[PDB]
Write a structure and sequence with these properties.
The structure is cut from a larger assembly and holds five copies of chain A (299 residues). The first copy, chain A, is 18% helix and 33% strand. Chain A folds into two domains: 1-135, Roll (2,3-Dihydroxybiphenyl 1,2-Dioxygenase, domain 1), CATH 3.10.180.10; 136-299, 2,3-Dihydroxybiphenyl 1,2-Dioxygenase, domain 1 (Roll), CATH 3.10.180.10. Chain A has 299 residues and is an alpha+beta fold. In chain A, strands 10-11-12-9-13-16-15-14-17 form a nine-stranded mixed beta sheet. The first copy, chain A, has helices spanning 17-28, 72-84, 94-100, 157-166, 220-232, and strands spanning 4-13, 31-33, 40-44, 52-55, 61-69, 90-91, 102-109, 115-122, 149-152, 173-178, 184-190, 199-201, 210-217, 237-243, 250-255, 261-266, 283-284. In chain A, a hairpin with a 5-residue loop joins β10 (173-178) and β11. Chain A has five helices and 17 strands. Chains in contact: A-B, A-E, B-C, B-D, B-E, C-D, D-E. Chain A binds chain B through residues 5, 68, 70-72, 103, 120-127, and chain B through 170, 172-173, 245, 273-283, 299. Bound molecules: 4-methylcatechol (30 copies), fe (ii) ion (FE2) (5 copies) and magnesium ion (5 copies). One 4-methylcatechol binds at residues 13, 59, 61-63, 209 of chain D. Chains A, B, C, D, E: Keywords: Aromatic hydrocarbons catabolism, Dioxygenase, Iron, Metal-binding, Oxidoreductase, Plasmid, Repeat. Chains A, B, C, D, E: Pathway: Aromatic compound metabolism; naphthalene degradation. Chains A, B, C, D, E: Involved in the naphthalene catabolic pathway. Catalyzes the meta-cleavage of 1,2-dihydroxynaphthalene (1,2-DHN) to yield 2-hydroxychromene-2-carboxylic acid. Chains A, B, C, D, E: This is 1,2-dihydroxynaphthalene dioxygenase.
């Protein structure tokens, strides 16, 4: 059955490109690639030409998520599936596909308004191995798991679930978290490969499309050094170190120059098709810096 | 689903059979088998009776590619599939099948005019283990991967892709290579088993059906010795040693007595169903000898 | 898809039960189980209550082959498949099923006239571990591979193939063996599990239903001792020690007291779905004693 | 502790070099190497320049056994050990060492009169991989196990044992075999590496220094084919196929053109330091052709 | 027994430090570390503070080899062993040890005049992971194998062998290579850990202490890219790509800015204690650029 197989790339727009270059390299160990374009640069994690496009003169938010399918037959099948179900899509011409450096490209929006791209045939620069922006003990976990995961804004969880399910994702409510005001927040997490989740959401108020992006190190030492960099440089940590009940990953959440959060992590477990839920994390992920997309403790 | 499972055998015709015997044995380590026929001999690589038929009084080009299916049910299913799709096929009688030493045989041509045979039931001489034409450290990689791969001539890539897809192959454009004249050459690569590719093509001008045949050694030492044989004997090397971005194989391309190229290699990676593309090889495969099927550098 | 999964049991009839008890125990290492019945006894190989039923006052030939399916749903599906295709079957009542010690039983004949039973739910005596009729270094290869294999008589190979294919077997002509008279004998071999073949046949003249039964030792030492027993006791060996091209097993063929052959063996390879053929065995299996079901050399 | 580590090479002399070339290649699969010397040629089994030197104008017997030590320090230590114990040795000059193609060489005789050489630094031709004299499924077992083993003549087992023990071998009486005349033959077997034995002997009357040489195939198929070659060509088999109780190897013993026996085999077990004994082999090794070094059955 | 366990560090002096920084980073992928010292900088390969010290205002040759022992007890034992055998050593004070960044240090010269240091307790910067001077697919092989190997000048091979044997190395003559003038060059290779050799030499005329330094990549792709860098930048290659008979490594030899050779390589085999010799390499290592420390082909 035709399905999305990974979060292949994403685009963000920023107001301060120079701050983003220093942040990405020094704080995270990502590689900056500048192709001489006036309005954008790239961040690499592996052999792909890029994983993140960073657009200038921007909004400090997500621009697009790029979801990969295996090839042209799955691209065509999924496109027709979306059309048959009543979703509005546009099949892109050669110029637009070349902009993203993919062989085939279609554009749509998810039910929450998040620009969503489906593509086949990423550009891989095997001649240009990843070279991190600071020394690293290891590298990033990508491969069959794609670049990482995001929590994005939604207005109707059922509608969002319908859309991502059509795309081949699996998952449902995995957390029922008590809120300070007596309500219970339901968070849904969906997978499309071995990464425990690639997309997640609730129907929570949010000023930005993007709540956080999670990037995963192969080595615990790089995660620890990254955490220390945030502390040393007095960068806000919204949720402190902890371990998630679903994916078993060791992570924290820190501010980016755009105000949405980065979640550096290590040791994510394999996705499971069998739905379960929790009322909190294993421990940690307590609130430190207030006033971010995540103001409430997870355990 | 019924599908081609390997490149089982191939036939070539040559103007100089004696030169071909010395080339195949000394330069490559293939085994010559002469069954006393006036007009042909065989080259072996493994337990199969043969992998290559070498016809005399010839054209210095490919005569046929022989694609294996698992058995009679898949043979019949694929035959009917070709007929239903409007392709012209001929089901061969016992005499023609016996000529190829197979249990069932059908003949057609691919959209580029390359004679294409589909068969089941190869003859295996378990009593006669491979005995290479020169001493070898190892042997050849065949088995589930078939004999090797070819690049062949096509006039319409989309039509070629349709035909091979019907036969059960998977793959698409994997290289977009800049050409000296400012154009971009698109090369497509298709697999039917664990070998990264078994057939590949672009819509490129070509005097011969066959651009090159790739044969894979189990041992790096045999590849190195083969490379040294080409250098020592001053045989043209069209593309020097390098590593492909798609299959990760260490290979070079040298002249055969027929003028098309042999690509001896080592360390091919497992095929992947997920389409990606590159703008060049990892490195190497630079042009040395000019005037062959490949005049342009691959990295 | 519903299919036969193993040769579960078989029945033979004999004129000399006492000779058969001594032969089975001393020459082969099978276990004799006598349940006090006037007209039969059993031979064991493993935890099954039995693998071979030996009927008295007999014909020195095969009485029935018992083919297992996984359970009742597959039994019912296969029964209906046979009926729909025009084959005559009888679904057995409780008394007949109890005679065979199975939970469900149907009876038919293959196109060559060989009585064929299909059943589910064999009786396993876990409380009664196999105890061989002579000391053994090892045991027998059974399990997922069933008891062994037989070559049986057929009058029309295509009809036989159709029947066994309906039952879920796979396989075709694997040998084209030159005969002394200038003809070529075609032998077909079919599998229904990991055993390289469980049933095989050609359209060859035969006085008996059963040409041979093959039983496989886990240990080479037991095969060698068995071979030595045949030599020491001057029991006819029709085909001497050799190795088959298809299953790679080390075997010989010796006379039983019933005149059909036993093929003791060791080291059978895993079945393959990809059809190939040979013109002889790896070596050995030359003719020694003449006048048996196999009078012609296999290599 | 300084010790012999393998049977590295051996020398034989023959009356019929041409018969020996055909025998070694066709019957055994050894590689003939002729360096243009008037009086000798070589047999190869692996990457070593050679394992067996075949001298012309000879006696149809063993000329020397060449025992390897790890290096110069062990060579010197063992030389001094032999001198201290009262054995007569000669340290060879450069010319004599070069004849054997070794870096250091000493010559002596064992207590039975068998010329015995101790050396370090064999010549290995890594550029020249083994190329068998007939097609082989596999190759030979050499490496840490050396070339094979011999039974040689002795007049005093205790004296022989003392000598080989000084050289670093371990082992003792492993067989007490009943003889037709009512006596019991004691055979001793000694190891110096993982090969179950490299040298063995009893105090038995013998016209030749060499009773037999055992060579081990990696693949059972090559052993079987070799056995079939002896049968087909009507070459005397002194002891038929069987399995040894000590090393668990499948072997037979056949005549060479020199009248002493070759023991082709397969599946030798790892040497053990713990002494045990047997009164016969597992089975087989019965007498067929009479009048050879071995006239008595082993089981 | 106390012994040297690896080539831990080395010092070189150069006339052109800027050329060396560009060469080391771009051509080899080494990491430049400048600690602000006026007269030296460092090259890193791994977590060690450094592996190579590069001194300014120099002689374009080796300054010292630094051989590690396990700890203080082995340092003291080896020091006393050298004194007892009549070698001149100096035990260094704290200032000299701190210069090398080691816990204990002694200085001597080998019999060929090559400055030789023995130390315990290297400085490891676990906080500062290796960051190569160009992007790399992999990293370097160091660890238990130390930094690499050198061939250095000697005037008396027996004396050199005595010295290195006292230090705990093992090895002897491994090559007897025919020279153009009819002589035979003997080369000796010694190991002190799993690296096939760490030091090697003959008694050959040489203008420099250092003939070559070998550095080993984990990944074949980095070796290939390095080879391509030498070709592209028209840097002299003295011996072309080939494989050594002793260590089985794929290597070539290229000019450094100091005129002695670097030998980049991949796939070195484990050292063996059993001495063997060869008359050439497996193949390759033919002469290209003349006028370097190696003017003669190795195969
Ligand atoms: C900000 C921006 C710039 C270019 C694009 O193609 C896009 O999608 C967004
Ligand atoms: C919500 C939104 C609107 C426009 C943008 O360019 C963007 O990144 C986000
Ligand atoms: C907890 C949360 C915060 C912001 C979001 O956009 C979301 O989907 C969930
Ligand atoms: C649950 C799961 C695990 C691994 C996968 O590759 C996948 O698609 C789903
Ligand atoms: C592994 C670990 C250690 C300390 C923490 O506070 C935590 O959340 C996790
Ligand atoms: C509650 C939760 C679980 C896993 C995540 O990756 C995350 O961001 C939040
Ligand atoms: C040249 C040639 C000869 C015989 C054939 O069967 C064939 O296909 C081609
Ligand atoms: C193009 C072509 C035509 C005829 C042949 O026999 C051949 O090998 C090729
Ligand atoms: C690059 C190339 C050259 C010749 C061909 O026939 C082809 O398909 C591709
Ligand atoms: C991609 C792939 C890998 C292995 C196979 O056997 C196959 O058919 C396809
Ligand atoms: C492994 C390797 C070594 C050298 C080369 O030039 C190359 O292309 C590959
Ligand atoms: C560009 C390319 C990649 C892989 C191949 O086998 C080949 O011949 C060419
Ligand atoms: C001879 C015989 C006896 C009983 C049976 O049930 C049978 O099938 C055959
Ligand atoms: C052919 C045949 C007929 C009756 C039997 O009982 C039997 O075993 C065989
Ligand atoms: C060779 C052979 C002999 C007897 C048979 O019944 C058969 O099917 C095949
Ligand atoms: C070819 C094959 C191998 C194993 C099996 O279990 C089977 O049913 C078929
Ligand atoms: C393993 C083996 C040994 C001897 C033989 O004759 C044979 O056929 C097989
Ligand atoms: C020719 C052949 C192959 C395999 C067998 O089991 C057999 O009985 C015969
Ligand atoms: C017969 C013979 C010839 C030369 C030798 O060196 C030797 O030991 C024996
Ligand atoms: C006993 C004996 C004597 C001389 C030889 O040359 C020989 O090979 C054997
Ligand atoms: C049994 C035997 C035969 C000959 C010998 O030389 C020997 O040592 C033992
Ligand atoms: C008994 C034994 C086993 C292995 C060896 O390497 C050895 O020297 C001894
Ligand atoms: C494995 C084997 C088979 C038959 C024999 O006679 C023997 O000795 C060994
Ligand atoms: C009795 C015996 C055991 C092992 C051998 O190798 C042999 O030649 C004899
Ligand atoms: C050239 C140089 C400079 C400082 C040192 O300590 C040394 O050994 C060499
Ligand atoms: C031979 C030599 C002399 C002095 C040095 O500083 C040096 O590096 C080498
Ligand atoms: C072959 C060679 C060249 C230079 C040296 O210093 C050496 O020891 C060996
Ligand atoms: C020969 C060898 C192999 C590994 C080692 O660690 C060593 O010291 C020696
Ligand atoms: C692996 C390899 C390939 C080509 C060569 O020339 C060589 O020496 C080694
Ligand atoms: C002849 C040789 C072998 C191995 C080496 O590392 C080397 O430099 C030279
Ligand atoms: Fe997250
Ligand atoms: Fe190719
Ligand atoms: Fe059989
Ligand atoms: Fe023996
Ligand atoms: Fe070297
Ligand atoms: Mg989940
Ligand atoms: Mg592909
Ligand atoms: Mg089969
Ligand atoms: Mg023993
Ligand atoms: Mg060595």
């Amino acid at each position: 059955q035709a399905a999305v197989i990974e979060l292949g790339y994403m685009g963000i727009s920023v107001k301060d490109p120079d701050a983003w270059k220093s942040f990405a390299t020094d704080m995270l160990g990502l590689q900056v690639l500048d192709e001489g374009e006036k309005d954008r640069f790239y961040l690499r994690m592996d052999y792909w030409h890029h994983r993140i496009v960073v657009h200038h003169n921007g909004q400090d938010d997500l621009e697009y998520l790029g979801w990969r399918v295996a090839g042209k037959p799955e691209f065509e099948a999924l496109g027709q599936k979306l059309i048959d179900a009543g979703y509005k899509i546009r099949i892109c011409d050669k110029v637009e596909a070349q902009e993203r450096m993919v062989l085939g490209l279609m554009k749509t929006e998810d039910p929450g308004g998040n620009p969503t791209e489906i593509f086949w045939g990423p550009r891989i620069d095997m001649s240009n191995p990843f070279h991190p922006g600071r020394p690293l003990h290891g590298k990033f976990v990508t491969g069959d798991q794609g670049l990482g995961h995001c929590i994005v804004r939604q207005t109707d969880v059922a509608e969002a679930h319908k859309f991502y399910s059509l795309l081949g994702f699996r998952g449902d409510v995995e957390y029922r978290i008590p809120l300070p005001n007596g309500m219970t927040a339901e968070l849904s997490f969906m997978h499309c490969n071995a990464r425990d989740h690639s997309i997640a959401f609730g129907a929570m108020p949010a000023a930005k499309r993007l709540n956080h992006l999670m990037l995963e190190y192969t080595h615990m030492e790089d995660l620890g050094y990254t955490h220390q960099q945030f502390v040393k440089n007095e960068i806000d940590i919204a949720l402190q170190l902890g371990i998630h009940a679903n994916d078993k990953a060791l992570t924290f959440y820190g501010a980016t120059p755009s105000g949405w959060l980065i979640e550096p992590g290590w040791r994510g477990a394999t996705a499971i098709d069998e739905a379960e839920y929790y009322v909190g994390d294993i421990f940690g992920h307590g609130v430190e810096a207030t006033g971010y997309g995540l103001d409430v403790k997870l355990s």
